[PDB]
Symmetry: C2
């Protein structure tokens, strides 16, 4: 969910070798939290889509058989 | 695109305050490389799951019409 820009700033902040240890730990924690959530959501759309796909496949085959008959007649 | 496990490794590597200044920028790049991808696949997936969703409902509709039609013959 973090806009590539927003995420970019963080990548920035972490560039500083002299960044406090408290603030750089905080930054890496946000990357973690955000990445975990992202993966989660992506993982849903991916299982939800895989299913939605299966249904489509059934229907394509089903209809291809029916359509072969609108031709018989 | 980057296994949670794989991303977890990077975030730990970057926690070390001593890490080689050249080296943290290197790894700090992957988080931008990978994050670029992710934001993409997720957008295409959403762009695709929308479309599939529609096609699915239409296949249902065209399945109903095909069937019913063959029955008139």
């Amino acid at each position: 969910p973090l806009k590539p820009e927003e995420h970019e700033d963080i990548l920035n902040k972490l560039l500083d070798p002299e960044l406090a240890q408290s603030e750089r730990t905080e930054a890496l924690q946000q990357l973690r939290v955000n990445y975990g959530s992202f993966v989660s959501e992506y993982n849903d759309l991916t299982k939800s889509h895989e299913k939605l796909a299966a249904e489509k496949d059934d229907l394509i085959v089903s209809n291809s058989k029916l359509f072969r008959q609108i031709g018989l007649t």
